[PDB]
Amino acid sequence: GDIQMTQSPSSLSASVGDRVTITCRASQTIWSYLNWYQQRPGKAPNLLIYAASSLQSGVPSRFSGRGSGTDFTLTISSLQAEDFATYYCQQSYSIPQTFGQGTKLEIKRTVAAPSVFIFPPSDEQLKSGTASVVCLLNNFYPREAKVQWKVDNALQSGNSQESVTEQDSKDSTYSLSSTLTLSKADYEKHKVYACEVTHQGLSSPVTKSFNRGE
Amino acid sequence: XVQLXXSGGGXVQXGXSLXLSCXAXXXXXXXXXXXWXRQXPGXXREXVXXXXXXXXXXXXXDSXXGRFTXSXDXXXXXXXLQXXXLXXXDXAXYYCXXXXXXXXXXXXXXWGXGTXVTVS
Amino acid sequence: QVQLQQSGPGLVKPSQTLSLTCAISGDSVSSNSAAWNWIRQSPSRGLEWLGRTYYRSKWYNDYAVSVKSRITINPDTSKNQFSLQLNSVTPEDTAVYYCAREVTGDLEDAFDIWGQGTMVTVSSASTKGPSVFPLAPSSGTAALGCLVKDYFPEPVTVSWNSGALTSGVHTFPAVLQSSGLYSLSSVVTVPSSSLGTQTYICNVSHKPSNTKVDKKVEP
Statement to judge: residues A23 and A41 lie in one domain: yes
Q: CB of C96 within 8 A of CB of C42?
A: yes
Residues in B lying within 8 Å of A, measured between beta carbons: 1-3, 25, 27, 100, 107, 109-110
Give the residue among C204, C121, C98 at the shortest CA–CA distance from C156: C204
| Cα–Cα distance for residue pair A112/A137, rounded to 1 Å | 11
Helix (H) or strand (E) holding B70: strand B68-73
Mind spelling out the 3-state secondary structure of A43-70? CCCEEEEECCCEECCCCCCCEEEEEECC
Whole-angstrom Cα distance, residue C106 to residue C62? 21
- Please check whether residue C73 is in contact with residue C82, taking contact to mean a CB–CB distance below 8 angstroms: yes
Q: Encode B13-39: b = buried (16+ Cβ within 10 Å), e = exposed.
A: eeeeebebbbbbeebebeebbbbbbbb
Query: How many whole angstroms separate alpha carbon A198 and alpha carbon A203?
Result: 9
Quote the number of domains for chain B.
1
- Nearest chain A residue to B107 by CA: give it: A129
Please give the Cα distance from C203 to C212 (Å, whole number). 7
B115 sits in which H/E element: strand B115-119
Number of domains in chain A: 2
Q: Do domains C3-122 and C131-216 have the same CATH topology?
A: yes
CB B93 within 8 A of CB B115: yes
Q: Decide if C30 contacts C101 (C-beta within 8 A).
A: no
C63 in Cβ contact with C73 (< 8 Å) = yes
Q: Which residues contact A120 (CB under 8 A, 6 or more apart)?
A: A133, A193, A210, A212, C136
Q: How was this structure determined?
A: X-ray
* Contact in structure between A98 and A13 (CB atoms under 8 Å): no
**How many degrees, rounded to 5, is the angle at CA C152 between CA C6 and CA C160?**
70
Question: How far apart are the C-alpha atoms of C170 and C187, rounded to whole Å?
Answer: 5
Three-state DSSP string of C92-127? HHCEEEEEEEEEEECCEEEEEEECCCEEEEECCCCC
Q: Residues B97, B4: contact at Cβ < 8 Å?
A: yes
CA C214 from centre of chain? 21
Residues A103 and A137 in one domain: no
Q: What whole-number distance in Å separates Cα of residue B87 and Cα of residue A91?
A: 46
Picking from A108, A136, A169, the residue at the C-terminal end of a domain is A108
Q: How many CB atoms lie within 10 A of CB C174?
A: 18
| β-sheet bridge partners, residue C201 | C216
**What's the domain range around B35?**
1-120
Nearest to A180 by CA among B2, C204, C131, B108: B2
- C-beta of residue A161 within 8 angstroms of C-beta of residue C181: no
- With a CB cutoff of 8 Å and minimum separation 6, the contacts of A98 are A1, A2, A3, A4, A5, A90, A91, C49
Q: Are C151 and C210 in contact (CB under 8 A)?
A: no
Q: Please name the chains neighbouring B, where neighbouring means 3+ C-beta pairs under 8 angstroms.
A: A, C
Q: Which helix (H) or strand (E) holds C60?
A: strand C59-63
Residues found in chain C: 219
C87: closest CA of chain B, how far (Å)? 15
CATH number assigned to the domain comprising residue A96:
2.60.40.10
**Whether residue A141 sits in one domain with residue A52:** no
What CA–CA distance (Å, rounded) separates C216 from C146?
9
A133 near A193, Cβ under 8 Å? yes
- Boundaries of every domain in chain C: 3-122, 131-216
Collapsed DSSP state (helix, strand, coil) of residue B29: coil
Of the candidates A154, A140, A142, A135, the residue with the CA atom closest to the CA atom of residue A210: A135
Rounded Cα–Cα distance for residues A121 and C183 (Å): 14
- DSSP 3-state of A211: strand
Note whether A122 and A81 are same-domain residues.
no
Nearest Cα of chain C lies from the Cα of B109 at a distance, in angstroms, of: 8
Q: Which of A108, A128, A147 is the last residue of a domain?
A: A108
In angstroms, rounded to a whole number, what is the distance separating the alpha carbons of residues A100 and A24?
7
Interface test with A, best of C45, C111, C150 (most A CBs within 10 A): C111
DSSP letter (8 states) at residue C165? B
Distance of alpha carbon A35 from alpha carbon A212, whole angstroms: 57
At the fourth CATH level, the homologous superfamily of domain C131-216 is: Immunoglobulins (2.60.40.10)
Instruction: Say whether both A140 and A74 belong to one domain.
Output: no
Amino acid found at A3 = I
A66 and A120 fall within a common domain: no
Closest residue to B109, CB basis, from A151, A158, A183: A183
Give me the domain span that covers residue A79. Answer: 5-108
Which overall architecture, per CATH, does domain C3-122 show? Sandwich (2.60)
